[PDB]
């Protein structure tokens, strides 16, 4: 066990999209790969062979983010049209249109129970929705700048959000109250955040070309990850725990970066993308990485490793 | 997309 470094190789390229891809997410059941784009479209691909499945349309503008329900039955999207849509993956049909945000919707996620949805927007608020009714349960004045990321913890009792205002906040799901604010004296814009698979920590990407692992419980910075380039775009970062433990993230030098979780040293740099890697995701069960890039690339790539 | 620029 405890591999020293992985060996990710390019297996497939998924070209369908006609405009820059914004994000890619593996389904919880591991069967599918969903992708959002500026072309107003969502697309389903086979997670293993990259075979194109279907196109899901309905939004009136570009979509910045997409997320799966726990049973892999539903999808939620965040669009520039100020709304979110819940989709039935099987029929590609719009079940609910979540209206209430006053500006672009930047990010979105289900809770593990998948009865709620969290969303961030350029209107600087975090909103909590009821999946069944499509109602907006709570609106949080989360930040003083656009919200770049939103994520539930393991039991969905907490929400983590990040913003350009350089702040990062944990919220109590049930009350909407802010429980913790993570401050940095240099406070670079926080471009992304998410809880660790175990829920003890949060991984925060910040626009000073740095990724940081925080113990939000005791407000301690455990790890730093650099070497990559990120000064402009809100780029997804992941924990990879199917094989060896690593950190995965896109970059503005058109590369996919992989650090050793503990040593913080770069173990591999995936080459092939002809534009900024805006989104990366790791397969729930297998050693598989998915990556997407912007206007000059517009494609998704599937990488596989042994470690 | 706002995320793609």
From Swiss-Prot, chain A:
GO terms for cellular component: ATAC complex; histone acetyltransferase complex; histone methyltransferase complex; mitotic spindle; MLL1 complex; MLL1/2 complex; MLL3/4 complex; NSL complex. It comes from Homo sapiens. Changing residue 20 to E: Strongly reduced affinity for histone H3. Gene3D superfamilies: YVTN repeat-like/Quinoprotein amine dehydrogenase. The record marks 80, 106, 236, 295 as: Important for interaction with histone H3. Changing residue 294 to A: Abolishes histone H3 binding. This is WD repeat-containing protein 5. Changing residue 122 to A: Significant decrease in interaction with KMT2A. One of its GO terms (biological process) is gluconeogenesis. The lineage of its organism: Eukaryota, Metazoa, Chordata, Craniata, Vertebrata. Interacts with PAXBP1; the interaction is direct and links a WDR5-containing histone methyltransferase complex to PAX7 and PAX3. Interacts with HCFC1. Component of the ATAC complex, a complex with histone acetyltransferase activity on histones H3 and H4. Component of the SET1 complex, at least composed of the catalytic subunit (SETD1A or SETD1B), WDR5, WDR82, RBBP5, ASH2L/ASH2, CXXC1/CFP1, HCFC1 and DPY30. Core component of several methyltransferase-containing complexes including MLL1/MLL, MLL2/3 (also named ASCOM complex) and MLL4/WBP7. (Microbial infection) Interacts with herpes virus 8/HHV-8 protein LANA1; this interaction regulates the MLL1 histone methyltransferase activity on viral DNA.
